[PDB]
Amino acid sequence: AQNPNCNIMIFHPTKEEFNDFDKYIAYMESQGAHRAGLAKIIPPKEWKARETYDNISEILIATPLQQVASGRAGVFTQYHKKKKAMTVGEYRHLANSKKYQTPPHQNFEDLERKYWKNRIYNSPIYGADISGSLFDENTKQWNLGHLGTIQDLLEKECGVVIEGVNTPYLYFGMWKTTFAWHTEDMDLYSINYLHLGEPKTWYVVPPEHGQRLERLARELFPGSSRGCGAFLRHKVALISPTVLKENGIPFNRITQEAGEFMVTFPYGYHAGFNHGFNCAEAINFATPRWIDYGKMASQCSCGEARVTFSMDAFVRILQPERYDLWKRGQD
Ligand SMILES: O=C(O)CNC(=O)C(=O)O
Ligand SMILES: [Mg+2]
Ligand code: NI
Ligand SMILES: [Zn+2]
């Protein structure tokens, strides 16, 4: 069995190996990459996402979110307070202001310590889930707006044509902006490209151990758990590496830098934080190996998680018994 310790693997494809996305994902899995839940892909030196980032300041962040924490330093929830619209240029200036800028630090480990010690005492502002792309249309390899769609994949594997579309999203981050512990909708893959700026630190639990994380989360968030059997789908719960280690949960950590891709694999729970002003682009995708995970994915039926249009068909076709209850939670 390849990668039996479930370590995060890092790949360096050549330009020839960068031509066929599906083939290279399947190659990574042949080496056991999926067992970690997360892999890093460093693109060939010949590749670029676009020519420059000099012309992005006029992108609008229609609904910036202030991430307000409740709890203790290693175990907290966050809610998202809506703020007034601002441009990427205005947000960048805000990120770099004294109130929000990254503090002086020695290295990534020192910044991680500072994050976990101090995150709860501040409320950083995040631009999330902005439909759009920063890939040049003439970038032909690993262009996140030109991947095969999940609806086409389900049709190819299972024979059923379904409605829906699959497009990328942009994320504008600052110091302390946080992504809570979650798997993807319908336990899909994700791919994330850090276009510019400061790093992103990731934490991940191997898919084969995901239920260990869920059990700890029910213990640490007992009211949330009573409310919803799939409350991690709400994307609000944080648990520090120190707390995970105290509870014997298997996990790994890695820092993504500008110009690097990350792939999350089906049922790989992940969380993390941004180091300073940055911009990432991400999209969900599927492969033949996803289908069996999609059929078994938990679902939030309490009202809180309330998802993409295009999730309807995946629940309807892969999870017909759950469909009626799930849909009641969407109305
Ligand atoms: O860029 C982000 O905010 C974090 N993205 C994800 O959780 C992802 O790509 O799966
Ligand atoms: Mg612009
Ligand atoms: Ni994710
Ligand atoms: Zn719920």
Short mmCIF file of C-alpha atoms and ligand atoms in Angstrom, two decimals:
data_model
loop_
_atom_site.label_atom_id
_atom_site.label_comp_id
_atom_site.label_asym_id
_atom_site.label_seq_id
_atom_site.Cartn_x
_atom_site.Cartn_y
_atom_site.Cartn_z
CA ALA A 1 0.00 0.00 0.00
CA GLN A 2 1.58 3.35 -1.07
CA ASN A 3 2.04 6.15 1.55
CA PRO A 4 0.81 4.08 4.51
CA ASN A 5 1.71 6.80 7.09
CA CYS A 6 -0.61 9.24 5.09
CA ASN A 7 2.02 11.94 4.69
CA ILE A 8 1.38 15.02 2.61
CA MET A 9 3.19 14.51 -0.72
CA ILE A 10 4.70 17.21 -2.89
CA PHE A 11 4.84 16.84 -6.70
CA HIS A 12 6.99 18.52 -9.33
CA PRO A 13 5.43 17.72 -12.74
CA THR A 14 7.35 18.50 -15.89
CA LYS A 15 5.67 20.62 -18.62
CA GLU A 16 4.77 17.40 -20.47
CA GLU A 17 3.25 15.87 -17.37
CA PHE A 18 1.26 19.11 -16.80
CA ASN A 19 -0.72 18.59 -20.03
CA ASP A 20 -3.26 16.10 -18.90
CA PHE A 21 -4.94 17.05 -15.57
CA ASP A 22 -6.89 13.79 -14.98
CA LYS A 23 -3.91 11.63 -15.85
CA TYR A 24 -1.64 13.50 -13.34
CA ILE A 25 -4.28 13.26 -10.53
CA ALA A 26 -4.54 9.53 -11.15
CA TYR A 27 -0.65 9.32 -11.10
CA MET A 28 -0.56 11.08 -7.73
CA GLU A 29 -3.09 8.65 -6.36
CA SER A 30 -1.03 5.66 -7.73
CA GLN A 31 1.72 6.97 -5.37
CA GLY A 32 -0.70 7.13 -2.40
CA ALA A 33 -1.12 10.94 -2.34
CA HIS A 34 -4.81 10.75 -1.45
CA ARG A 35 -4.15 8.95 1.73
CA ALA A 36 -3.00 12.26 3.32
CA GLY A 37 -6.18 14.10 2.26
CA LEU A 38 -4.07 16.96 0.75
CA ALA A 39 -1.17 17.20 -1.78
CA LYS A 40 0.98 20.08 -3.02
CA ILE A 41 1.76 20.52 -6.75
CA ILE A 42 4.58 22.83 -7.78
CA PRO A 43 4.00 23.79 -11.47
CA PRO A 44 6.82 23.51 -14.03
CA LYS A 45 9.03 26.60 -14.19
CA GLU A 46 7.77 27.24 -17.81
CA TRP A 47 4.16 27.70 -16.58
CA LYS A 48 2.38 30.86 -15.46
CA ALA A 49 -1.26 31.52 -14.47
CA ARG A 50 -1.34 34.91 -16.14
CA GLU A 51 1.19 37.66 -17.13
CA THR A 52 0.83 40.04 -14.11
CA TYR A 53 -1.28 40.87 -11.05
CA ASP A 54 -1.02 44.58 -11.70
CA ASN A 55 -4.57 45.04 -12.87
CA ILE A 56 -6.76 43.39 -10.13
CA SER A 57 -7.60 46.31 -7.81
CA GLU A 58 -10.96 47.02 -9.27
CA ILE A 59 -12.43 43.56 -8.61
CA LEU A 60 -15.32 44.03 -6.15
CA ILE A 61 -15.74 42.18 -2.89
CA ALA A 62 -19.50 42.66 -2.63
CA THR A 63 -19.90 41.19 0.86
CA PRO A 64 -16.64 41.16 2.92
CA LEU A 65 -17.04 38.99 6.02
CA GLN A 66 -15.68 39.81 9.49
CA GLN A 67 -14.79 36.54 11.18
CA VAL A 68 -15.76 36.88 14.86
CA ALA A 69 -14.64 34.07 17.23
CA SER A 70 -16.26 32.58 20.38
CA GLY A 71 -14.64 30.03 22.73
CA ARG A 72 -11.12 29.37 23.84
CA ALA A 73 -7.86 29.80 21.97
CA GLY A 74 -7.58 26.15 20.81
CA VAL A 75 -11.37 25.37 20.49
CA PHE A 76 -13.61 28.05 19.01
CA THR A 77 -16.33 28.74 16.53
CA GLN A 78 -16.47 31.71 14.18
CA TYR A 79 -19.42 33.54 12.67
CA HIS A 80 -19.34 35.79 9.70
CA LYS A 81 -20.52 39.34 10.06
CA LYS A 82 -21.41 41.08 6.78
CA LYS A 83 -19.58 44.33 5.98
CA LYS A 84 -19.99 47.02 3.28
CA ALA A 85 -18.64 46.34 -0.20
CA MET A 86 -15.11 47.22 -1.05
CA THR A 87 -12.70 46.83 -4.01
CA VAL A 88 -9.63 44.54 -3.94
CA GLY A 89 -7.50 47.75 -3.81
CA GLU A 90 -9.38 48.96 -0.75
CA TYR A 91 -9.16 45.51 0.86
CA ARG A 92 -5.43 45.26 0.24
CA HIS A 93 -4.91 48.62 1.95
CA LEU A 94 -7.05 47.43 4.90
CA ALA A 95 -5.12 44.16 5.20
CA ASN A 96 -1.81 46.18 5.34
CA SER A 97 -3.12 48.68 7.97
CA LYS A 98 -1.74 48.58 11.50
CA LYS A 99 -4.97 47.02 12.85
CA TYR A 100 -4.79 43.98 10.48
CA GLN A 101 -1.23 43.53 9.19
CA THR A 102 0.88 40.46 9.83
CA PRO A 103 3.09 40.90 12.96
CA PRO A 104 6.80 40.56 13.01
CA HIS A 105 7.77 36.95 13.19
CA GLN A 106 10.82 34.58 12.82
CA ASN A 107 9.52 31.88 10.58
CA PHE A 108 6.35 30.03 9.70
CA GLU A 109 6.38 28.05 12.96
CA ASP A 110 6.56 31.26 15.04
CA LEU A 111 3.64 32.73 13.01
CA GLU A 112 1.65 29.50 13.62
CA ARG A 113 2.27 29.86 17.37
CA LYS A 114 1.08 33.43 17.28
CA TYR A 115 -2.02 32.47 15.28
CA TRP A 116 -3.14 29.84 17.75
CA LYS A 117 -2.34 31.97 20.75
CA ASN A 118 -4.00 35.17 19.58
CA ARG A 119 -6.54 34.49 16.77
CA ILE A 120 -9.63 34.63 18.97
CA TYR A 121 -8.83 38.17 20.15
CA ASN A 122 -9.13 39.72 16.71
CA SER A 123 -11.77 39.69 13.93
CA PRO A 124 -10.10 39.74 10.49
CA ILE A 125 -12.10 40.53 7.32
CA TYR A 126 -12.26 37.91 4.53
CA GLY A 127 -13.43 38.12 0.83
CA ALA A 128 -14.83 34.65 0.20
CA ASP A 129 -16.61 32.71 -2.45
CA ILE A 130 -16.43 35.40 -5.17
CA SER A 131 -17.38 33.76 -8.47
CA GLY A 132 -14.62 34.47 -10.97
CA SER A 133 -11.14 33.60 -12.31
CA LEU A 134 -7.67 35.13 -12.57
CA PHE A 135 -6.33 32.56 -15.02
CA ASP A 136 -5.54 33.97 -18.46
CA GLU A 137 -7.78 32.45 -21.07
CA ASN A 138 -4.67 31.42 -22.95
CA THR A 139 -3.23 29.39 -20.05
CA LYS A 140 -3.88 25.89 -21.35
CA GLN A 141 -2.63 23.69 -18.48
CA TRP A 142 -4.25 23.53 -15.04
CA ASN A 143 -6.54 26.43 -15.75
CA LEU A 144 -9.15 26.16 -13.01
CA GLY A 145 -11.87 27.67 -15.24
CA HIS A 146 -11.34 24.98 -17.94
CA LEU A 147 -11.49 21.79 -16.00
CA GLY A 148 -13.99 19.00 -16.83
CA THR A 149 -17.26 19.61 -14.95
CA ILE A 150 -18.57 17.45 -12.15
CA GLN A 151 -21.88 17.08 -14.03
CA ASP A 152 -20.05 15.69 -17.06
CA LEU A 153 -18.10 13.31 -14.80
CA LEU A 154 -21.33 11.96 -13.20
CA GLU A 155 -22.78 11.57 -16.68
CA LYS A 156 -19.68 9.72 -17.96
CA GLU A 157 -19.60 7.35 -14.94
CA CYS A 158 -23.27 6.75 -14.31
CA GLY A 159 -25.05 7.59 -17.58
CA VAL A 160 -27.43 10.20 -16.24
CA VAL A 161 -27.40 13.76 -17.70
CA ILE A 162 -28.03 16.39 -15.02
CA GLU A 163 -28.47 20.16 -14.78
CA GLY A 164 -25.88 22.38 -13.10
CA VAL A 165 -22.65 24.16 -13.62
CA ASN A 166 -19.28 24.17 -11.84
CA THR A 167 -17.30 27.48 -11.80
CA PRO A 168 -14.24 28.77 -9.84
CA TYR A 169 -14.19 31.12 -6.94
CA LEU A 170 -11.76 33.76 -5.66
CA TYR A 171 -10.74 34.30 -2.01
CA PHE A 172 -9.03 37.48 -0.76
CA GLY A 173 -7.34 36.88 2.62
CA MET A 174 -5.49 38.76 5.32
CA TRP A 175 -3.61 37.82 8.49
CA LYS A 176 -5.66 35.51 10.69
CA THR A 177 -8.41 34.88 8.11
CA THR A 178 -9.51 31.32 8.83
CA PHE A 179 -11.05 28.34 7.10
CA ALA A 180 -12.83 26.05 9.52
CA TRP A 181 -12.63 22.25 9.68
CA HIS A 182 -14.68 20.74 6.82
CA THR A 183 -14.76 18.38 3.88
CA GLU A 184 -15.98 19.58 0.48
CA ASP A 185 -19.64 19.59 -0.50
CA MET A 186 -20.61 15.99 -1.36
CA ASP A 187 -17.04 15.00 -0.28
CA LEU A 188 -15.68 16.26 -3.66
CA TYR A 189 -12.09 17.05 -4.46
CA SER A 190 -10.91 20.63 -4.45
CA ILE A 191 -8.03 22.38 -6.14
CA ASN A 192 -6.68 25.63 -4.87
CA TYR A 193 -4.14 27.93 -6.57
CA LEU A 194 -2.47 30.69 -4.50
CA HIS A 195 -2.19 33.45 -7.12
CA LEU A 196 -0.40 36.11 -5.09
CA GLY A 197 0.67 37.37 -1.73
CA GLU A 198 1.36 35.78 1.60
CA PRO A 199 1.20 32.08 2.46
CA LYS A 200 -1.65 29.84 3.62
CA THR A 201 -1.10 27.19 6.32
CA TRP A 202 -3.18 24.01 6.02
CA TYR A 203 -4.10 21.23 8.42
CA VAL A 204 -5.60 17.92 7.18
CA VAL A 205 -6.88 14.60 8.59
CA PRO A 206 -6.37 11.47 6.40
CA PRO A 207 -9.67 10.32 4.84
CA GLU A 208 -9.37 6.92 6.44
CA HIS A 209 -9.44 8.66 9.87
CA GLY A 210 -12.13 11.26 9.25
CA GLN A 211 -14.57 9.73 11.71
CA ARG A 212 -12.02 10.29 14.53
CA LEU A 213 -12.14 13.97 13.84
CA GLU A 214 -15.98 13.92 13.71
CA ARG A 215 -16.16 12.16 17.11
CA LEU A 216 -13.84 14.73 18.70
CA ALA A 217 -15.80 17.55 17.14
CA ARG A 218 -19.07 16.23 18.63
CA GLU A 219 -17.37 16.19 22.05
CA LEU A 220 -15.91 19.71 21.71
CA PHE A 221 -18.98 21.34 20.23
CA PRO A 222 -21.78 19.56 22.07
CA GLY A 223 -24.61 22.06 21.39
CA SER A 224 -23.73 22.34 17.67
CA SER A 225 -23.68 18.53 17.44
CA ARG A 226 -27.17 18.23 18.98
CA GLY A 227 -28.43 20.74 16.44
CA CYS A 228 -27.11 18.95 13.32
CA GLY A 229 -25.64 15.50 12.69
CA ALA A 230 -23.40 17.07 10.04
CA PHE A 231 -22.60 20.39 11.73
CA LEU A 232 -19.08 20.56 10.35
CA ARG A 233 -20.82 21.32 7.03
CA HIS A 234 -21.56 24.73 8.62
CA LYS A 235 -17.92 25.60 8.33
CA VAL A 236 -17.62 27.29 11.70
CA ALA A 237 -15.54 25.03 14.05
CA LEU A 238 -11.82 25.35 14.78
CA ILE A 239 -9.61 22.99 16.71
CA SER A 240 -5.87 23.65 17.17
CA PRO A 241 -3.02 21.25 16.41
CA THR A 242 -2.26 21.13 20.15
CA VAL A 243 -5.80 19.98 20.93
CA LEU A 244 -5.77 17.45 18.10
CA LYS A 245 -2.43 15.98 19.42
CA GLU A 246 -3.85 15.83 22.97
CA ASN A 247 -6.76 13.79 21.65
CA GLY A 248 -4.66 11.48 19.46
CA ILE A 249 -6.17 12.62 16.17
CA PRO A 250 -3.99 11.81 13.19
CA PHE A 251 -3.25 14.97 11.09
CA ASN A 252 -0.60 16.77 9.06
CA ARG A 253 0.29 20.36 8.32
CA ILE A 254 1.88 22.22 5.36
CA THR A 255 2.31 25.83 4.20
CA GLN A 256 1.32 26.77 0.64
CA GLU A 257 3.15 29.70 -1.02
CA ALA A 258 2.24 31.90 -3.99
CA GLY A 259 2.49 30.00 -7.27
CA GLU A 260 1.65 26.60 -5.76
CA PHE A 261 -1.42 24.35 -6.14
CA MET A 262 -3.04 22.28 -3.36
CA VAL A 263 -5.39 19.38 -4.01
CA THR A 264 -7.79 18.17 -1.33
CA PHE A 265 -9.08 14.64 -1.73
CA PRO A 266 -12.55 13.16 -1.05
CA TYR A 267 -13.42 13.07 2.65
CA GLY A 268 -10.12 14.85 3.65
CA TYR A 269 -11.12 17.17 6.49
CA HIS A 270 -9.03 20.34 6.35
CA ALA A 271 -8.70 23.80 8.06
CA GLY A 272 -6.14 26.62 8.03
CA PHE A 273 -5.29 30.30 8.01
CA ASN A 274 -3.73 33.00 5.89
CA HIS A 275 -0.44 34.72 6.81
CA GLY A 276 -1.24 38.14 5.29
CA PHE A 277 -2.82 39.71 2.22
CA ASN A 278 -3.30 37.07 -0.49
CA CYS A 279 -5.55 35.91 -3.30
CA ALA A 280 -6.45 32.25 -4.00
CA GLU A 281 -8.71 30.63 -6.60
CA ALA A 282 -10.39 27.31 -5.96
CA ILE A 283 -12.93 24.91 -7.57
CA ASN A 284 -14.39 21.51 -6.80
CA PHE A 285 -13.80 18.60 -9.18
CA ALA A 286 -14.48 14.92 -9.48
CA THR A 287 -12.83 11.76 -10.78
CA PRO A 288 -14.16 8.19 -11.15
CA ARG A 289 -12.88 7.44 -7.62
CA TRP A 290 -15.08 10.20 -6.13
CA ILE A 291 -18.42 8.52 -7.01
CA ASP A 292 -18.33 6.12 -4.08
CA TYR A 293 -17.54 8.94 -1.68
CA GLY A 294 -20.35 11.06 -3.04
CA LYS A 295 -22.85 8.27 -2.38
CA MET A 296 -21.82 8.14 1.32
CA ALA A 297 -21.31 11.87 2.06
CA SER A 298 -23.12 13.27 5.09
CA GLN A 299 -25.54 15.93 4.65
CA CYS A 300 -26.70 19.03 6.60
CA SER A 301 -30.55 19.05 6.69
CA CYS A 302 -30.98 21.69 9.57
CA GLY A 303 -30.96 24.84 7.42
CA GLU A 304 -27.52 26.18 8.33
CA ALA A 305 -25.15 24.87 5.58
CA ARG A 306 -27.51 25.92 2.62
CA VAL A 307 -25.44 25.16 -0.55
CA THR A 308 -24.90 25.59 -4.37
CA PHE A 309 -27.74 25.11 -6.86
CA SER A 310 -25.76 22.31 -8.46
CA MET A 311 -25.72 20.16 -5.24
CA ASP A 312 -29.38 19.31 -5.77
CA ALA A 313 -28.69 16.92 -8.63
CA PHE A 314 -25.82 15.21 -6.85
CA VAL A 315 -28.05 14.42 -3.81
CA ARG A 316 -30.95 13.46 -6.05
CA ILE A 317 -28.99 10.94 -8.14
CA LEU A 318 -26.41 9.63 -5.64
CA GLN A 319 -28.53 9.80 -2.43
CA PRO A 320 -32.21 9.38 -3.40
CA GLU A 321 -33.25 8.17 0.05
CA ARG A 322 -31.86 11.36 1.68
CA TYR A 323 -33.11 13.72 -1.05
CA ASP A 324 -36.54 14.62 0.40
CA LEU A 325 -35.20 15.52 3.91
CA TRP A 326 -32.14 17.33 2.54
CA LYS A 327 -34.39 19.40 0.25
CA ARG A 328 -36.72 20.36 3.13
CA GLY A 329 -33.51 21.89 4.82
CA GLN A 330 -32.92 23.96 1.66
CA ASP A 331 -36.50 25.51 1.74
O1 LIG B 1 -8.69 29.36 -0.10
C1 LIG B 1 -9.49 28.88 0.88
O2 LIG B 1 -10.12 29.66 1.58
C2 LIG B 1 -9.58 27.53 1.47
N1 LIG B 1 -10.06 26.73 0.39
C3 LIG B 1 -10.45 25.49 0.67
O3 LIG B 1 -10.88 25.07 1.85
C4 LIG B 1 -10.24 24.57 -0.51
O4 LIG B 1 -9.62 24.86 -1.61
O5 LIG B 1 -10.71 23.44 -0.25
MG MG B 2 -9.33 45.18 -11.58
NI NI B 3 -12.13 23.16 1.35
ZN ZN B 4 -26.79 21.61 9.72
#
